Amino acid sequence: RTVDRLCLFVVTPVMVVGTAWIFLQGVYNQPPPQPFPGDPYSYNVQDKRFI
Amino acid sequence: YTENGEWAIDFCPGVIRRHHGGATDGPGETDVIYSLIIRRKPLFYVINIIVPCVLISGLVLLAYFLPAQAGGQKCTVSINVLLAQTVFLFLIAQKIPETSLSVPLLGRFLIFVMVVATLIVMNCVIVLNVSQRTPTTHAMSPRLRHVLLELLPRLL
Amino acid sequence: IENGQWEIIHKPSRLIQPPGEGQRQEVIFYLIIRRKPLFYLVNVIAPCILITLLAIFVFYLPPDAGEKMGLSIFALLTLTVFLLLLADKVPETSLSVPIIIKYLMFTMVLVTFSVILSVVVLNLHHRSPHTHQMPLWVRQIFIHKLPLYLRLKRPKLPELREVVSSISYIARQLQEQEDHDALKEDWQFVAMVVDRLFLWTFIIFTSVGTLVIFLDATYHLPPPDPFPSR
Amino acid sequence: NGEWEIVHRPARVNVDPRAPLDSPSRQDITFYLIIRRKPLFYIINILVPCVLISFMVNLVFYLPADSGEKTSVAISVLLAQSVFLLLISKRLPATSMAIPLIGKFLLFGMVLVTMVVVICVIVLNIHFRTPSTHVLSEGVKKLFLETLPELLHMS
Amino acid sequence: SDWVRMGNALDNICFWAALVLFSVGSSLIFLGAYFNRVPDLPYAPCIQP
Amino acid sequence: HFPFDEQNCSMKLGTWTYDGSVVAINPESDQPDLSNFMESGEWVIKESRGWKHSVTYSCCPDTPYLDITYHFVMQRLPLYFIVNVIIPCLLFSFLTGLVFYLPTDSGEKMTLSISVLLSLTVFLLVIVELIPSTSSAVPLIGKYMLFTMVFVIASIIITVIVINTHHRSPSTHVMPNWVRKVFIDTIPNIMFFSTMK
Amino acid sequence: HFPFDEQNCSMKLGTWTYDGSVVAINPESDQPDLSNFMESGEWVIKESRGWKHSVTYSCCPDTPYLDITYHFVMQRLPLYFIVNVIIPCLLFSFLTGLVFYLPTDSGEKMTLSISVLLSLTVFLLVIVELIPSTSSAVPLIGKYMLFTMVFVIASIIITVIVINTHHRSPSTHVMPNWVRKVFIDTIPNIMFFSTMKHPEVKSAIEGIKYIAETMKSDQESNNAAAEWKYVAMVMDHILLGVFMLVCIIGTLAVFAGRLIELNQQG
């Protein structure tokens, strides 16, 4: 019973933390604000580049 | 002619139909309709699906003969027959037609045996609940005892 | 557009002359391409290794737990699920067997033998001491010789007359139960020794076979030259 | 689209200065689609079931050894994870550039469930020891019956 | 022991109930197909034997 | 509302290169012609209707753009999904609660609950191959599946707690006073009370 | 005989609209030209040959219709189906008989048998995915799969019978004389196993007597139960032998006929 309780308190946090790290890698994965890195232009109809 | 591996052509009459010959309809129309009455040869479904499913679904009746003790594994047999029937449902979903005008015989049989397995699982749970009653938790019902031990054998 | 599953090792082109009109030359463009197996390592090989480890560890499970059979047979069931996974991917020709199929069937055979030997261990453990008598060679091998090699150390007035009779009967029954327990403990110790022997045998066989297959896979390199001498 | 949302959608004239002016590869116009997956379907039908089934394996540590159903629970969780892996295998290509996030979680969960099965085997081995099989030393008793329970605040 | 005997009697009668249910339902479902032969139509066979 | 969903699917038709000032299209009838319509084994067309539309942009005042849109309201026939999806889920949901009538001493509570879970997991293959793989919304089938899965998991958790409680002894635990008060005295008075204390 | 099946597919060629009286076709050679044939990973062409045919119908006695039918006799290469289908079925069939060596007191007999059935049921998905699905006849793989399934089902049924016999209470059930004659007396001869005055003082005296009689009654009950357990034991050994023999004989009866035929043809 003592070994089981220790293994609970050791293994369950590891599972929770690993799952959290793996899934917060993806939840906060978004495309960049601009289509092309290094190019500030947004290529949107609101930001027209008049000649 | 080489017969199709699954379909035998039993009949094939042809009829020339004429229609829209009325004045309101205007010019008449015609066509030729052939009616292939074709019979399925169900040997594949019999050997690979129906017979194994029937035997596996018959296995739940064996649960009534296992002891109502810890090592009887009555519920093991019943619920694992249910799991095998779920596997057979996955197998059958790949083959059955996907229309909703009626329920196919294979689907009806599989749902029926699944319902029977569920009822027998409930029965095994009830029998185990009755069998493992001990004086330290449950009181002796005399009515049920008279019904099952005394009245039933004489009635039976 | 680089392929996600294939790396181009070589890419030569050759002019093939006719043998020795209707004769026709050819221009053959060769692509020697190596598969990048990360998907199969993640989805097949590592689960198989884990299942193999559990199949080993079933021999450390005590017989009295009543759980050896479930563990081994559900390991086999999981391996069947992985066979279903591989059925969609593996080639369907019959000139040779893929090495991953060889590894899968090797693991299936190990799990099957773990099931069989667990049944043997449970038969020894639950053996009736009254119906069965331990043969002397079984005693000598599995209680005296083998435990030393496996590092298994086994520890170690009518009323008064009728009352005397009852007490003597009770003591005799308890003595008989003690003898029965001694025989039952001998059988259980033999089962334990056999279980440890099978544990070490499975460790050795698993390690050797897995290493052989893995080294056969790892050392299969692409050809350094597109047209090697034969 | 029922699964893809357009984030960016630029258009560019690309001219390759290196190519000769008489090459078809000199000039082109490229229309790009940056598209974000809407993961509600995969969330509901895969991730919540898979994650919860993986997390239930930790319940074996709270199961008593006398229940006789510990390794069965753990190996069944492993089997369910294998079924989920079979599910994933039909949906993505077998590319080697990276392990998918769901694939990463499934590998992590399978490894942890295997460790939990091994731990359950060891715990059951400890639980069923008797004087006729093992010697219970005083050090093990001191460590596991007094010292670790008081640190763990056990009853 | 009285509880075990009660459980045994329940098991005995419910076995027969379940057997009748399974057999009758399966037989009815499959005899539904048994009477689904191709009708005896007033046409010659498509393939003359 | 899938599989009890009603759909409204349209067919927009127009002259691609001719505008209303050169070619004019008019509907032949208010409704599409369904006289030669084959029966569908999956859908019922409740309503059908064709409408003409004319659109004039501010940059082209003089060239109206015409179209005829034929729409069909279609109700799915749900029997196939009732038989092949809903009923097995209902059976699993029913089997979920039966573990709580099983005695702990049977040593089969986890067997039953985990086997129900495994059946649900295997049935997941059927459901995802049948359910639409779109993320616009959660179908009713998906909601019921998630309900069933979540509550078999909850039953497994609570069953582990119940089995842990059953196996307690004075050699490991001491009975709290509140547990005794709640479960031995108050609740059995509002129960069948056919069980000794 | 699948996957040890030989096939004979033809390719009938003819002038669709021209009869033999206006257009005559002749084969270039007796055999198809296989000089540029790519090796197949699934089939070996044992034989190939082209034959010309001329047919005159009753209502057209002056326009013979000509055709050239090429034909190829092909033998399937069965290694893929042997490895992927037959070997797992062999392993399941071998594991089917091991339940009869598993004692009843382990409490794991139904676990083993039912889980072998579950593994076979899951593998049925593999079989249906791999082999063709046709109803012209039962393939040899189909016969072997059905044999394995019926073998597992029979093992489960007989295991339930053995478990029922093992657990028979001696109070409710009384051992028939015939059961004792066959299983305890006759069969083990062929086998090698062993057959089967203050009030308080008087109250205490009667208590010792009652304890002694209670252990005596328990001993009789235990011996009577042990008779049933011995019967189940003997049945388990016989059934282990019978099931291993049935496994071997069934595998041979399924495969060895076609294997011997192919051996005789080479």
Ligand SMILES: *[C@@H]1O[C@H](CO)[C@@H](O[C@@H]2O[C@H](CO)[C@@H](O[C@@H]3O[C@H](CO[C@H]4O[C@H](CO)[C@@H](O)[C@H](O[C@H]5O[C@H](CO)[C@@H](O)[C@H](O)[C@@H]5O)[C@@H]4O)[C@@H](O)[C@H](O[C@H]4O[C@H](CO)[C@@H](O)[C@H](O)[C@@H]4O)[C@@H]3O)[C@H](O)[C@H]2NC(C)=O)[C@H](O)[C@H]1NC(C)=O
């Ligand atoms: C989606 O996917 C698209 C592609 O399908 C991505 O678009 C790409 O974005 C990147 C970054 O915004 C672009 O790279 C930049 O390119 C410019 C221009 O260089 C190009 O054009 C020149 C003529 O105008 C030409 O001379 C260049 O050729 C030289 O360079 C290349 C290598 O770039 C080399 O191979 C040649 O031999 C030549 O030497 C080239 O054709 C360039 O100026 C940028 O340089 C900046 O950024 C880099 C970052 O590494 C940095 O090192 C530099 O110092 C400098 O700061 C950069 O290379 C790429 O061209 C785009 N591809 C297209 C349009 O097809 C898009 O970003 C993706 N979106 C995402 C991920 O959201």
Ligand SMILES: *[C@@H]1O[C@H](CO)[C@@H](O[C@@H]2O[C@H](CO)[C@@H](O[C@@H]3O[C@H](CO[C@H]4O[C@H](CO)[C@@H](O)[C@H](O)[C@@H]4O)[C@@H](O)[C@H](O[C@H]4O[C@H](CO)[C@@H](O)[C@H](O)[C@@H]4O)[C@@H]3O)[C@H](O)[C@H]2NC(C)=O)[C@H](O)[C@H]1NC(C)=O
């Ligand atoms: C990928 O697959 C291709 C085939 O599609 C392989 O290409 C073959 O490679 C082999 C070995 O490199 C080649 O065999 C060699 O051919 C040489 C040229 O032969 C031609 O010319 C002579 C006259 O000069 C003709 O008689 C002959 O018919 C050919 O037309 C030979 O000179 C070589 O001989 C040498 O090796 C042999 C080995 O048996 C020795 O016996 C000789 O003494 C001598 O040392 C040899 O025969 C073959 O031609 C290639 N086929 C082609 C190009 O179509 C690739 O190797 C393979 N790549 C891999 C596996 O990485």
Ligand SMILES: *[C@@H]1O[C@H](CO)[C@@H](O[C@@H]2O[C@H](CO)[C@@H](O[C@@H]3O[C@H](CO[C@H]4O[C@H](CO)[C@@H](O)[C@H](O)[C@@H]4O)[C@@H](O)[C@H](O[C@H]4O[C@H](CO)[C@@H](O)[C@H](O)[C@@H]4O)[C@@H]3O)[C@H](O)[C@H]2NC(C)=O)[C@H](O)[C@H]1NC(C)=O
């Ligand atoms: C399924 O989905 C389809 C869309 O594909 C819906 O179709 C719409 O149906 C409604 C009717 O229920 C249509 O509304 C009607 O449009 C007529 C045509 O409008 C064109 O022509 C007029 C005249 O030139 C223009 O003014 C107009 O801009 C269009 O160019 C109108 O004549 C109708 O007017 C009638 O109703 C209004 C109600 O406000 C009254 O004020 C009027 O006096 C008159 O009684 C009406 O507006 C609509 O146009 C359709 N849209 C399409 C096809 O794109 C289905 O309704 C939907 N089904 C269900 C069950 O939801």
Ligand SMILES: *[C@@H]1O[C@H](CO)[C@@H](O[C@@H]2O[C@H](CO)[C@@H](O[C@@H]3O[C@H](CO[C@H]4O[C@H](CO)[C@@H](O)[C@H](O)[C@@H]4O)[C@@H](O)[C@H](O[C@H]4O[C@H](CO)[C@@H](O)[C@H](O)[C@@H]4O)[C@@H]3O)[C@H](O)[C@H]2NC(C)=O)[C@H](O)[C@H]1NC(C)=O
């Ligand atoms: C795989 O399947 C194919 C397709 O069915 C089989 O092909 C048959 O092969 C046999 C030979 O094994 C063929 O039999 C031979 O036919 C020849 C041509 O017949 C035509 O021409 C003659 C002459 O004009 C006509 O009389 C006849 O009606 C046809 O129009 C004959 O010349 C051969 O005669 C030889 O054998 C006979 C044996 O009785 C002798 O009497 C003769 O003297 C001579 O020696 C012979 O009859 C048959 O026609 C093929 N049928 C086809 C292609 O449809 C393969 O045999 C089969 N392979 C297996 C099972 O391994």
Ligand SMILES: CCCCCCCC/C=C/CCCCCCCC(=O)O[C@@H](COC(=O)CCCCCCCCCCCCCCC)COP(=O)([O-])OCC[N+](C)(C)C
């Ligand atoms: C999974 C690993 C991490 C968790 C471990 C949990 C341990 C928790 C703490 C355990 C505390 C034990 C206290 C009581 C016993 C004290 C005396 C003693 O040590 O001897 C006892 C064992 O004791 C053990 O339980 C040792 C650990 C398990 C041994 C199995 C191999 C190592 C772990 C699994 C493989 C790891 C690698 C692969 C899988 C990752 C008696 O030993 P024996 O029975 O006479 O002989 C053993 C022989 N054997 C070792 C060959 C079997």
Ligand SMILES: CC(C)CCC[C@@H](C)[C@H]1CC[C@H]2[C@@H]3CC=C4C[C@@H](O)CC[C@]4(C)[C@H]3CC[C@]12C
């Ligand atoms: C730890 C176990 C349950 C694994 C799964 C963890 C999931 C449920 C958690 C971990 C961190 C969470 C995110 C943390 C913060 C935010 C920002 C806020 O706008 C709510 C959504 C969002 C984006 C959460 C979504 C759910 C989330 C991704």
Ligand SMILES: CC(C)CCC[C@@H](C)[C@H]1CC[C@H]2[C@@H]3CC=C4C[C@@H](O)CC[C@]4(C)[C@H]3CC[C@]12C
């Ligand atoms: C649950 C148990 C009792 C029965 C299992 C089989 C089920 C699937 C069977 C039993 C009765 C059957 C229904 C009986 C009659 C009809 C009317 C017909 O016009 C369409 C099919 C329909 C609606 C059937 C569908 C399938 C059905 C619901």
Ligand SMILES: CC(C)CCC[C@@H](C)[C@H]1CC[C@H]2[C@@H]3CC=C4C[C@@H](O)CC[C@]4(C)[C@H]3CC[C@]12C
């Ligand atoms: C691993 C063991 C214990 C069980 C599984 C046996 C497997 C590995 C056996 C069964 C049949 C065997 C194949 C039979 C014949 C050939 C053809 C030739 O090219 C030699 C190797 C090859 C391709 C063998 C490779 C190994 C093989 C696939």
Ligand SMILES: CC(C)CCC[C@@H](C)[C@H]1CC[C@H]2[C@@H]3CC=C4C[C@@H](O)CC[C@]4(C)[C@H]3CC[C@]12C
């Ligand atoms: C234990 C509970 C939380 C169930 C497990 C949830 C797991 C699977 C996690 C992993 C990633 C998570 C998602 C990541 C991002 C978001 C933020 C927002 O868009 C709503 C929730 C949503 C969509 C999360 C839902 C929960 C989620 C799917």
Ligand SMILES: CC(C)CCC[C@@H](C)[C@H]1CC[C@H]2[C@@H]3CC=C4C[C@@H](O)CC[C@]4(C)[C@H]3CC[C@]12C
């Ligand atoms: C399975 C057991 C428990 C119940 C059986 C009930 C019977 C009466 C049910 C089950 C399936 C049903 C059939 C299912 C579908 C159809 C097609 C429909 O166009 C006419 C009715 C008909 C032909 C039904 C008639 C009644 C039916 C045969």
Ligand SMILES: CC(C)CCC[C@@H](C)[C@H]1CC[C@H]2[C@@H]3CC=C4C[C@@H](O)CC[C@]4(C)[C@H]3CC[C@]12C
């Ligand atoms: C009772 C215990 C076992 C937990 C039961 C499962 C719980 C955690 C499940 C059941 C329903 C699930 C939610 C269903 C749908 C959504 C919307 C989407 O944004 C993803 C996350 C989110 C919000 C899920 C989070 C996890 C969830 C709340």
